[PDB]
């Protein structure tokens, strides 16, 4: 386990952390879109 090997695996884990964040942002898009569509298709017609 050299220092170069450790630095590489540290970055690999950082990259996986960023990919999980990327996944979370994609689902935040879905969540905000769901609120928009609910307001548009359920609230606005009634009100």
């Amino acid at each position: 386990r050299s220092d170069i090997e450790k630095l590489k695996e540290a970055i690999r884990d950082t990259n996986k952390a960023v990919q999980s964040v990327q996944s979370s942002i994609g689902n935040l898009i879905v969540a905000i879109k769901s609120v928009q569509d609910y307001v548009n298709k359920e609230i606005v017609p009634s009100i």
Binding site: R1, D3, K6, S24, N27, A31, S34
Partner: protein
């Protein structure tokens, strides 16, 4: 109007947020090993 329910999506985001925190936890742990 039966109501907004985005609990499944919000709970998935939280789960992925936790997975993210775990990966950073492992990265910092390795950096400590240097």
């Amino acid at each position: 109007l039966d109501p907004i329910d985005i609990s499944i999506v919000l709970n998935k985001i939280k789960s992925q947020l936790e997975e993210s925190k775990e990966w950073i936890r492992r990265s910092n742990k390795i950096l400590d090993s240097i």
